[PDB]
mmCIF file of C-alpha atoms and ligand atoms in Angstrom:
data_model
loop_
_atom_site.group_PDB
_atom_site.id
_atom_site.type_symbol
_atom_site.label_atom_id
_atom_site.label_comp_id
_atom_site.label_asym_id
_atom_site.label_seq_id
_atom_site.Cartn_x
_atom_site.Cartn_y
_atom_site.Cartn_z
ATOM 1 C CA UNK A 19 158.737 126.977 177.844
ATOM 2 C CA UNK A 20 156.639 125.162 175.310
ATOM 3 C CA UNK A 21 154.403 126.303 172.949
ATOM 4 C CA UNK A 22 153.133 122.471 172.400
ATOM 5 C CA UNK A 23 151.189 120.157 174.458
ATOM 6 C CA UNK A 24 154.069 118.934 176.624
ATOM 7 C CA UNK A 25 152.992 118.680 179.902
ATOM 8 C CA UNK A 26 152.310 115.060 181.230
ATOM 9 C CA UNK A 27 153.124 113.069 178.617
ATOM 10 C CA UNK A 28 153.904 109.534 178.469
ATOM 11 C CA UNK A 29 156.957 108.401 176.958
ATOM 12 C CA UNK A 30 158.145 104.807 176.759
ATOM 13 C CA UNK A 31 156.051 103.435 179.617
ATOM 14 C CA UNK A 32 156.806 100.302 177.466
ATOM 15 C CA UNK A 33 159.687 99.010 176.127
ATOM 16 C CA UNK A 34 160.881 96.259 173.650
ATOM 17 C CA UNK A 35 162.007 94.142 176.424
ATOM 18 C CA UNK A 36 158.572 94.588 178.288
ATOM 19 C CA UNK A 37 155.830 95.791 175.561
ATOM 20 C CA UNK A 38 152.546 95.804 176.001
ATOM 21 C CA UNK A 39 150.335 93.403 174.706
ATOM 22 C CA UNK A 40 147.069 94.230 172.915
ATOM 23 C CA UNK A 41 144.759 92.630 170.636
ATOM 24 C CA UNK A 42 143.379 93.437 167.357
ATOM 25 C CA UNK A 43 140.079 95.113 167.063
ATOM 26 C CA UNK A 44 139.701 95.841 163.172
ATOM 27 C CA UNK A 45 141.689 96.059 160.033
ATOM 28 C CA UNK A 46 140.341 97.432 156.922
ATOM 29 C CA UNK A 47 141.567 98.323 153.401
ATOM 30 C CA UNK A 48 141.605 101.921 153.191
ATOM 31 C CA UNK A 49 142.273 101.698 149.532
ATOM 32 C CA UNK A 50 141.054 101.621 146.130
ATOM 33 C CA UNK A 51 142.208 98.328 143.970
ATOM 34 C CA UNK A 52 143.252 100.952 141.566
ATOM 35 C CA UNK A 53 145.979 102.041 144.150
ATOM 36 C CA UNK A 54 149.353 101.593 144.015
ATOM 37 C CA UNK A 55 150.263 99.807 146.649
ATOM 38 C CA UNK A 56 147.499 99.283 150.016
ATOM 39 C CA UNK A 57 147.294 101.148 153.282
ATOM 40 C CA UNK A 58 145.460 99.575 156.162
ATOM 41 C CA UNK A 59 143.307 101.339 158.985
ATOM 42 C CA UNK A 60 143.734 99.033 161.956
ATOM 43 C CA UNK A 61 142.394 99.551 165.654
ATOM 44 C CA UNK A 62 144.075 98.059 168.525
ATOM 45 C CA UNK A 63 142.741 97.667 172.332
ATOM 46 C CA UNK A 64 145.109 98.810 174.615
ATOM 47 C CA UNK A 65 142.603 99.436 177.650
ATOM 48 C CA UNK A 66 143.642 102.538 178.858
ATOM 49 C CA UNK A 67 147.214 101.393 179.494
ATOM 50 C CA UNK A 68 149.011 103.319 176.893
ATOM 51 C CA UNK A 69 148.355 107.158 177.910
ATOM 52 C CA UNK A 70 149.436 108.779 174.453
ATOM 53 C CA UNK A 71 148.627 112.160 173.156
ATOM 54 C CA UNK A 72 148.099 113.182 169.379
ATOM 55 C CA UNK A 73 151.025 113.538 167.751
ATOM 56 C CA UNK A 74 152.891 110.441 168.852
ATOM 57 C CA UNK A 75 154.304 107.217 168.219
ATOM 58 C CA UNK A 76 154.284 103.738 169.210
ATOM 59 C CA UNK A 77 156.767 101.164 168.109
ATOM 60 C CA UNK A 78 155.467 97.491 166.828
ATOM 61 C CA UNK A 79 157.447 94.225 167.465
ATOM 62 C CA UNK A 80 156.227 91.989 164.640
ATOM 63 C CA UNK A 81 156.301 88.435 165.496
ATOM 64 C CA UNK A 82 159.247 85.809 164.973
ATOM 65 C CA UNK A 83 162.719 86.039 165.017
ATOM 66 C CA UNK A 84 165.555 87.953 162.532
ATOM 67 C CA UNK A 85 167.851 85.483 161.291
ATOM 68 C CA UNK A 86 169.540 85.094 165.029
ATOM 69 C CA UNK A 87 166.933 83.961 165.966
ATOM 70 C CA UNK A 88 166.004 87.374 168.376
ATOM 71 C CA UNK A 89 163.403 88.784 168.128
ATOM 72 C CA UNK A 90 162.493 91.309 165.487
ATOM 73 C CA UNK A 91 163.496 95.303 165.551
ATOM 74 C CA UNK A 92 160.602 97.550 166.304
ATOM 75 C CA UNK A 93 159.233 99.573 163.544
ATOM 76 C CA UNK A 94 157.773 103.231 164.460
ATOM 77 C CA UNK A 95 154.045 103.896 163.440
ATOM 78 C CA UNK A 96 152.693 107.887 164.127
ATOM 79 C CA UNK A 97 149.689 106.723 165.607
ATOM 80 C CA UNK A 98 146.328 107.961 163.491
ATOM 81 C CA UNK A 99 143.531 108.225 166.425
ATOM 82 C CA UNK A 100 143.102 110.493 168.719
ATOM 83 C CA UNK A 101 143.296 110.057 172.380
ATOM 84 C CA UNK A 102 140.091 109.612 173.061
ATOM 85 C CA UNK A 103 140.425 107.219 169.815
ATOM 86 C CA UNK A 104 137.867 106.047 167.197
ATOM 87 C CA UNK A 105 135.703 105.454 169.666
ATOM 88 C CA UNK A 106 136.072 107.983 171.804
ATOM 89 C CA UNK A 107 136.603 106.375 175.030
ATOM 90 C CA UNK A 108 140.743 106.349 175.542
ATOM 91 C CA UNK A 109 141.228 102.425 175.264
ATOM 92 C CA UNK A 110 141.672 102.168 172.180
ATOM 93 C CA UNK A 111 145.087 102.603 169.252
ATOM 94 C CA UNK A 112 144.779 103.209 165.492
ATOM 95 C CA UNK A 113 147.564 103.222 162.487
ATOM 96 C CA UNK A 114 147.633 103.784 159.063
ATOM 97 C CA UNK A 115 149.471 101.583 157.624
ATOM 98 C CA UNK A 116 151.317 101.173 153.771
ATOM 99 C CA UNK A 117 152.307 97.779 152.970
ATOM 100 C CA UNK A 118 155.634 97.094 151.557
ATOM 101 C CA UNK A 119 156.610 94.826 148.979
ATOM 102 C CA UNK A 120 159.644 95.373 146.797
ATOM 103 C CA UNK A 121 162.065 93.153 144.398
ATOM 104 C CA UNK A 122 165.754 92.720 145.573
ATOM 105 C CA UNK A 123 168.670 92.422 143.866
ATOM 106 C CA UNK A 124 168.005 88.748 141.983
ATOM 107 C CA UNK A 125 164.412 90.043 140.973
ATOM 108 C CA UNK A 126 162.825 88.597 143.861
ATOM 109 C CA UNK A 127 159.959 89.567 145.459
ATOM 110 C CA UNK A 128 160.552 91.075 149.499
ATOM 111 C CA UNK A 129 157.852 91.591 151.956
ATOM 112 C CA UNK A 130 158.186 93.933 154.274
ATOM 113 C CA UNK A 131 158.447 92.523 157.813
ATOM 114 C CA UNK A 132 156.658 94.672 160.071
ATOM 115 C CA UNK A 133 154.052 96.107 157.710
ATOM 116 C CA UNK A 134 152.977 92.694 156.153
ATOM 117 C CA UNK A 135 152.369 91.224 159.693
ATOM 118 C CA UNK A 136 150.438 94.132 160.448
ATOM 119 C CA UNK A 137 148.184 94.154 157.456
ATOM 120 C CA UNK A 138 147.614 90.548 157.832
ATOM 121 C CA UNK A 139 146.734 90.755 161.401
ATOM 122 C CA UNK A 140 142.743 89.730 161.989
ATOM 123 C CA UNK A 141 140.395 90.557 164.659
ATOM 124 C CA UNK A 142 141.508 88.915 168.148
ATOM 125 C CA UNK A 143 144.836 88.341 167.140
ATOM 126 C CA UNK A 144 147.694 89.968 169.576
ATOM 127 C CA UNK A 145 150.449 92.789 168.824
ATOM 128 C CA UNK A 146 153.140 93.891 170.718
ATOM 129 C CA UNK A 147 153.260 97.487 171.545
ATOM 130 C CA UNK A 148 156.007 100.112 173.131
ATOM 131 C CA UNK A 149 155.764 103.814 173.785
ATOM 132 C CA UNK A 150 154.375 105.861 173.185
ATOM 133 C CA UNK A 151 157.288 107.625 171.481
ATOM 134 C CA UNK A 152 157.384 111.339 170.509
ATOM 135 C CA UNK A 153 157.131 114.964 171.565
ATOM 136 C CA UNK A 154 158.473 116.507 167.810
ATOM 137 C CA UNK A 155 154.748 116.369 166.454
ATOM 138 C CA UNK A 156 152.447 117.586 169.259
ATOM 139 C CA UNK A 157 149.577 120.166 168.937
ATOM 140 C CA UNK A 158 150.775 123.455 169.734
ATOM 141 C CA UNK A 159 148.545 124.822 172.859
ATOM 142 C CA UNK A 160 147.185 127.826 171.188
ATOM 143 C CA UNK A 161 143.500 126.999 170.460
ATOM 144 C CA UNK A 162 143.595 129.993 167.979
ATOM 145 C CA UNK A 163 146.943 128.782 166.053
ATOM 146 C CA UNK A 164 147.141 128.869 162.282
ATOM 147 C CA UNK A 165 147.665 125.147 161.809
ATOM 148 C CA UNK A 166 149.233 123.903 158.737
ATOM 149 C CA UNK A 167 149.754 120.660 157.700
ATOM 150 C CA UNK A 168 151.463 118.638 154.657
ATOM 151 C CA UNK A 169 151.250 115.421 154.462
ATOM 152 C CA UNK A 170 151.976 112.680 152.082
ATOM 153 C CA UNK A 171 150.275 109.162 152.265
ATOM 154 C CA UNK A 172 150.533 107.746 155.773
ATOM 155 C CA UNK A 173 151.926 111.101 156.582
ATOM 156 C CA UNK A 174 148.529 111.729 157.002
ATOM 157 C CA UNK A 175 148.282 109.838 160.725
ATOM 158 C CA UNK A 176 149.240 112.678 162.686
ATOM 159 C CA UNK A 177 146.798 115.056 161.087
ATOM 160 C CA UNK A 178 144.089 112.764 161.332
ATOM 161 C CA UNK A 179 144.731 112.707 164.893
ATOM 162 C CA UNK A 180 144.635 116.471 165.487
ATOM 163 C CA UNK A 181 141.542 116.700 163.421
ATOM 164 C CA UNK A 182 139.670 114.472 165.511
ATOM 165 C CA UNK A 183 140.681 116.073 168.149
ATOM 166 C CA UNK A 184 139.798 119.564 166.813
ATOM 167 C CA UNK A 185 136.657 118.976 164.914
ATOM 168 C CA UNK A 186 135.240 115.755 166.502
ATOM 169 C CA UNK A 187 135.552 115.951 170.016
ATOM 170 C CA UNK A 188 134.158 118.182 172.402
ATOM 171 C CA UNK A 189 136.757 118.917 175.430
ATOM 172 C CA UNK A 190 136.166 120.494 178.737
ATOM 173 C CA UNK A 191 139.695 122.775 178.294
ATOM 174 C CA UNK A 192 139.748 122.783 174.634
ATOM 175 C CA UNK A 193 138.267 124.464 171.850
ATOM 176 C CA UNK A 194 139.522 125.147 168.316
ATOM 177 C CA UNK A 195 138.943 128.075 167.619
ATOM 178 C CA UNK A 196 141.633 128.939 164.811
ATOM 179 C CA UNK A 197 142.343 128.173 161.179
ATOM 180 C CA UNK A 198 143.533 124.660 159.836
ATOM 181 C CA UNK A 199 144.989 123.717 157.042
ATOM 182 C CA UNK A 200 145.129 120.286 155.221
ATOM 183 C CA UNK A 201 147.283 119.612 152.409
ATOM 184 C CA UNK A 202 147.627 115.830 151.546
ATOM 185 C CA UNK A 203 149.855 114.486 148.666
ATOM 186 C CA UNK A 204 149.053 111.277 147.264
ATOM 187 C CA UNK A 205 149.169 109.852 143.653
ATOM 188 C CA UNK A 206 145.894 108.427 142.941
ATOM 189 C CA UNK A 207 142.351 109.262 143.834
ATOM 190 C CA UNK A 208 142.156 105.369 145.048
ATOM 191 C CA UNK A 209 145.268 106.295 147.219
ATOM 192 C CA UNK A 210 143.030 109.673 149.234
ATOM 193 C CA UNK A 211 143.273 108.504 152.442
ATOM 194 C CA UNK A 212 140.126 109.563 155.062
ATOM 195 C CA UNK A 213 138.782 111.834 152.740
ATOM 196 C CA UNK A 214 135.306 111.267 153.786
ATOM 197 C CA UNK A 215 136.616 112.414 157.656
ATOM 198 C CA UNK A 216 137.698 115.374 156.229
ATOM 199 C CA UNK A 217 134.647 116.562 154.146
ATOM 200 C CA UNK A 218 132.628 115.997 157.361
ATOM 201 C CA UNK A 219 134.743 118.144 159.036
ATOM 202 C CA UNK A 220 135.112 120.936 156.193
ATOM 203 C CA UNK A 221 131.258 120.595 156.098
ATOM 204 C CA UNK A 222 130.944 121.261 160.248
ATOM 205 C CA UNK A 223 133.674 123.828 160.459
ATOM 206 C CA UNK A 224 133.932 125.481 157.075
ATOM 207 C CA UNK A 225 135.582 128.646 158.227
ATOM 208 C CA UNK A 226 138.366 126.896 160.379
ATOM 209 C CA UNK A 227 138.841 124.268 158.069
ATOM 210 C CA UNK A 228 140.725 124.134 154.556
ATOM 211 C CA UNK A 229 141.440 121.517 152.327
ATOM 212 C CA UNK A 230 143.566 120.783 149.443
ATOM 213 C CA UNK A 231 144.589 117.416 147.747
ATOM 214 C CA UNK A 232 147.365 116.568 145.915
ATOM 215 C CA UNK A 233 146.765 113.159 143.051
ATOM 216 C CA UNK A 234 150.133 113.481 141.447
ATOM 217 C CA UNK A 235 148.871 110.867 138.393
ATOM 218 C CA UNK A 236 145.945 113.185 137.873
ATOM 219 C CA UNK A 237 146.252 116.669 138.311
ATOM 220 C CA UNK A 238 148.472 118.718 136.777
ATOM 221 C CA UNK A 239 149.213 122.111 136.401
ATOM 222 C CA UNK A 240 148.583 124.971 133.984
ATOM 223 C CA UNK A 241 152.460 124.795 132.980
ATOM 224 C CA UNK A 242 150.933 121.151 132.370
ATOM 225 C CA UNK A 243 153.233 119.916 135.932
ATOM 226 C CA UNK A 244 152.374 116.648 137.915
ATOM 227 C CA UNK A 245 150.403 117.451 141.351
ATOM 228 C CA UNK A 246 152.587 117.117 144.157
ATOM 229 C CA UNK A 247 152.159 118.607 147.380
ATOM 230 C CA UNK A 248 155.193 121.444 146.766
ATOM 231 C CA UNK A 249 152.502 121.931 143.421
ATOM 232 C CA UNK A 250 149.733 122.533 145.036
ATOM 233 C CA UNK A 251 151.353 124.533 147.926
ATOM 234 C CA UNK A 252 152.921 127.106 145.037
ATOM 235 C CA UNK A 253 149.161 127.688 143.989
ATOM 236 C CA UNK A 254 148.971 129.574 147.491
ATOM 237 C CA UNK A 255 152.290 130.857 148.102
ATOM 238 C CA UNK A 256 151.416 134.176 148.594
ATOM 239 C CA UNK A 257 148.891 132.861 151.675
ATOM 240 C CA UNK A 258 151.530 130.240 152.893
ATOM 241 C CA UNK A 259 154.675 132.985 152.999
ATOM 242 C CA UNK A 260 152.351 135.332 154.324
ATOM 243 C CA UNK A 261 150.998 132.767 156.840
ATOM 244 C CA UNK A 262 154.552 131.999 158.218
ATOM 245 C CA UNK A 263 155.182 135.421 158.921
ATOM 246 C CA UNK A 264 153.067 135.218 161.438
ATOM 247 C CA UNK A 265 154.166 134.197 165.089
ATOM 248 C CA UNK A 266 151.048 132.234 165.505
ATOM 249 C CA UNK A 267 151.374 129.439 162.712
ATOM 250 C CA UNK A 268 152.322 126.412 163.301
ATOM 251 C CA UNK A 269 153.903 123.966 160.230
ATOM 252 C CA UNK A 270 153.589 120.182 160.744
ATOM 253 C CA UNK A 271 155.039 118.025 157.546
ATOM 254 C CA UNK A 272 154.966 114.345 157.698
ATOM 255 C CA UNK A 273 155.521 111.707 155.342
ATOM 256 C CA UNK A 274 157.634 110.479 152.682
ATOM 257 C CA UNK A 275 161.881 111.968 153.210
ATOM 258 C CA UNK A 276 161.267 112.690 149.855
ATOM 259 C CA UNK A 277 158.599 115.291 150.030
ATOM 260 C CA UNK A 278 161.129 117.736 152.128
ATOM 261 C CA UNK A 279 163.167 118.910 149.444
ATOM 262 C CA UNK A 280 160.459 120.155 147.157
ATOM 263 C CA UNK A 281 158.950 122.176 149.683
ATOM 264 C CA UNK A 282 162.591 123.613 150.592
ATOM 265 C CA UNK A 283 162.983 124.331 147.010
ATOM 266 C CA UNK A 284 160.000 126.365 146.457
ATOM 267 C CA UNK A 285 160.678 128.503 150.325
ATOM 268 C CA UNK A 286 163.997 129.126 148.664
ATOM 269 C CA UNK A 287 162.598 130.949 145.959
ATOM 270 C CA UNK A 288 159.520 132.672 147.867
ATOM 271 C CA UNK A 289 161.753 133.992 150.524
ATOM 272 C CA UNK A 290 164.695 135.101 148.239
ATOM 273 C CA UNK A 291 162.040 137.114 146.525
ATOM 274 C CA UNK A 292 161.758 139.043 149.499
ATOM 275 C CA UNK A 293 165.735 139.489 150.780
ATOM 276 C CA UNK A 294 165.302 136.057 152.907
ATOM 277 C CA UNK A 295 167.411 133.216 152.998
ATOM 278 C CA UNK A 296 165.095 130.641 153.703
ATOM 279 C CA UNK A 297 167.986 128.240 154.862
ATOM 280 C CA UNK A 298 167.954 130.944 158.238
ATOM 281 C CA UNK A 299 164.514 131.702 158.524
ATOM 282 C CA UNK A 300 163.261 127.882 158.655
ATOM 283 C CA UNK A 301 166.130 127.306 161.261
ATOM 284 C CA UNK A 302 164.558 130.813 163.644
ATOM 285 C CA UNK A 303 160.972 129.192 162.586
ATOM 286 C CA UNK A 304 162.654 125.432 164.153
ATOM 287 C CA UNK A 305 163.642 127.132 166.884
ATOM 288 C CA UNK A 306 160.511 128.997 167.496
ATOM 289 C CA UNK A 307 158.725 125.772 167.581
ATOM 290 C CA UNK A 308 156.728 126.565 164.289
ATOM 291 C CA UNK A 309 158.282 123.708 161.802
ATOM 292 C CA UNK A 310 157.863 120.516 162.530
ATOM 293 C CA UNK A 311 158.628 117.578 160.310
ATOM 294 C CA UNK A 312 158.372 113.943 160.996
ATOM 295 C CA UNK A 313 159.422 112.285 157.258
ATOM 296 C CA UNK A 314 160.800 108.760 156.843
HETATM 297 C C1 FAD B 1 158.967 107.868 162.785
HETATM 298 C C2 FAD B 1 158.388 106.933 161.811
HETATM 299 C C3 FAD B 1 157.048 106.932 161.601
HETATM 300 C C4 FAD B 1 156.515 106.051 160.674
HETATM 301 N N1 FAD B 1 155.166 106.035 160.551
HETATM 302 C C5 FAD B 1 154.695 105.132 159.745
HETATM 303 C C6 FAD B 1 153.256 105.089 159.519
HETATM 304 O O1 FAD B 1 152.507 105.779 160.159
HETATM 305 N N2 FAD B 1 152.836 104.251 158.527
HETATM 306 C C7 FAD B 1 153.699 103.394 157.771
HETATM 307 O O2 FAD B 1 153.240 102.662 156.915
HETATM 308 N N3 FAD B 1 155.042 103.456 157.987
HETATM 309 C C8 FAD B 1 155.494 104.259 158.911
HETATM 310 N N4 FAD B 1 156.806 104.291 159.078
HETATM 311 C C9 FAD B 1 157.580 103.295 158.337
HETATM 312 C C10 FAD B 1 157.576 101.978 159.177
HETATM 313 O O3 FAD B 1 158.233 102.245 160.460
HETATM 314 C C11 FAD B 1 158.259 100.767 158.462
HETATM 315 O O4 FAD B 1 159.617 101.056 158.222
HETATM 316 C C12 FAD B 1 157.584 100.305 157.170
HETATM 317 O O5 FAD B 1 156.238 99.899 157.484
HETATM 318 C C13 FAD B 1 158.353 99.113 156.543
HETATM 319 O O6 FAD B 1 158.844 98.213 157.579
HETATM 320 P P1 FAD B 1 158.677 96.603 157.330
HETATM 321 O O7 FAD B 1 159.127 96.007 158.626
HETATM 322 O O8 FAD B 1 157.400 96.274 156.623
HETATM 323 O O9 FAD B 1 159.968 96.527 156.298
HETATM 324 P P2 FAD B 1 161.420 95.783 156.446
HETATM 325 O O10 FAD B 1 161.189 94.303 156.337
HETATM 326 O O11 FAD B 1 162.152 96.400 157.547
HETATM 327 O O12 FAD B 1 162.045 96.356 155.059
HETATM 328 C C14 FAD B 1 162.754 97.629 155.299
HETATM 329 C C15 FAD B 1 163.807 97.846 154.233
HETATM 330 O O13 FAD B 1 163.116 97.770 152.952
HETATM 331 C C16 FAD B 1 164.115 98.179 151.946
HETATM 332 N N5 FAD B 1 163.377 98.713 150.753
HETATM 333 C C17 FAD B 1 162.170 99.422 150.749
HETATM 334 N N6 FAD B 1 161.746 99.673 149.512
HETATM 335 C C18 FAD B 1 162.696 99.117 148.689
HETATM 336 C C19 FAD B 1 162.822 99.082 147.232
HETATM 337 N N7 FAD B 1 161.948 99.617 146.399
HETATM 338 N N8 FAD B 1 163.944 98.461 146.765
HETATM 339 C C20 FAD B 1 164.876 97.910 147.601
HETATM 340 N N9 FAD B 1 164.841 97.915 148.919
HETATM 341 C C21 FAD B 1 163.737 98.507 149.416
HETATM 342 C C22 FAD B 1 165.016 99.181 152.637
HETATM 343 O O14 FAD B 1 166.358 98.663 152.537
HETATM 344 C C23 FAD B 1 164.512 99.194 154.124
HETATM 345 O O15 FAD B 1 165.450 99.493 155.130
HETATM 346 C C24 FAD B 1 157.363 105.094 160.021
HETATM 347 C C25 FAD B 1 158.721 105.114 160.215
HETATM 348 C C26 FAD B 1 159.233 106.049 161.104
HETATM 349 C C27 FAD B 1 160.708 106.138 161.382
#
């Protein structure tokens, strides 16, 4: 009995042994020079042969071999389109991808495999593809649902793919009819990810649509407190505690491991306040299908 979009999806119709093949339609810089650090918007074609559904993954096998000469690990990317995709017709696969680059242990400089590849890739070259992978982050099937969701940086993929869905699409079964709820957490205004997507939408469905942005290196609180998500959220804990009360609201969190504990440590504290212990309640709202978190 699921309250998400379950039914007929595709899991793993390909595999690391047998991926799928596609070619590389556009990659862009979705940041600011500012930014700490870039995240790339990148389209693949996949003609129609990988049947995903927002929500989901798909793992990448970056060229070359590990040091054993086999072929690289796949790395998991929520995908950041739609369905239908960017361009609405179903054939094609977008990601949001951060690119990593860290210092080992002798001060060197390490790229990260899988997400340098990908942010070098240009138009027409190839990537290997499996999945899609995933049923933890799919849409619930209420149309009506009180739809929350915290993100931090790339966190923000699934959420952009609901969105579309919800607010860009028009679908012969489905119509959003309920209450959505963005909360992204990044650390610099050159680091706001899609933020022109989402004031389109706020502008075309302003009373099913709230926003709310986290720049930790920017925004602080009265008590003079960076801007994280957990930050921002505690501006509207009254709303959010009274919002998961509800049977019909559905939490989605995805992003940084990190950005759990914060937001555990503030539902502590709301829900004692009220004769809760949050450590049961979050497990009943698990179980009820009502929070969701995809961090890593
Ligand atoms: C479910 C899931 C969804 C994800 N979705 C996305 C997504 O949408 N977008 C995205 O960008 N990523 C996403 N990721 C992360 C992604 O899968 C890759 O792990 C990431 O892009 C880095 O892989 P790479 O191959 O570039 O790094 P690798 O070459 O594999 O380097 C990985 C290793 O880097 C080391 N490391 C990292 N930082 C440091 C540091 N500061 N100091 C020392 N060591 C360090 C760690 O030991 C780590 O295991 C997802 C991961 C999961 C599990």
């Amino acid at each position: 009995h699921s309250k998400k979009m379950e039914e007929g999806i595709t899991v793993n119709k390909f595999k690391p042994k047998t991926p799928y093949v596609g070619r590389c339609l556009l990659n862009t810089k979705i940041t600011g020079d500012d930014a700490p650090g870039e995240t790339w918007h990148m389209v693949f074609s996949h003609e129609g042969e990988i049947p995903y559904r927002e929500g989901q993954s798909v793992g990448v096998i970056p060229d070359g071999e590990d040091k054993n000469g086999k072929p690289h690990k796949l790395r998991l990317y929520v995908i950041a389109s739609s369905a239908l995709g960017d361009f609405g017709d179903a054939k094609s696969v977008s990601l949001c991808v951060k690119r990593l680059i860290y210092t080992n242990d002798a001060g060197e400089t390490i790229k990260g495999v899988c997400s340098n590849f990908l942010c070098d890739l240009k138009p027409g070259a190839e990537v290997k593809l499996t999945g899609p992978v995933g049923k933890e982050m799919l849409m619930p099937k209420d149309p009506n649902a009180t739809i929350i969701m915290l993100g931090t940086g790339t966190g923000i993929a699934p959420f952009r793919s609901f969105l579309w869905k919800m607010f860009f699409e028009k679908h012969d079964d489905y119509k959003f009819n309920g209450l959505a709820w963005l909360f992204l957490g990044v650390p610099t205004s050159s680091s706001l990810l899609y933020k022109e997507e989402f004031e389109k939408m706020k502008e075309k469905a302003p009373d099913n649509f709230r926003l709310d942005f986290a720049v930790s290196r920017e925004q602080t609180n009265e008590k003079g407190e960076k801007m994280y998500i957990q930050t921002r959220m505690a501006q509207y804990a009254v709303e959010l505690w009274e919002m998961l009360k509800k049977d019909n609201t559905y939490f989605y969190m995805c992003g940084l491991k990190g950005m759990e504990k914060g937001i555990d440590d503030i539902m502590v504290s709301l829900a004692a306040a009220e004769g809760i212990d949050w450590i049961e309640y979050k497990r009943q709202l698990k179980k009820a299908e009502q929070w969701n978190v995809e961090v890593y």
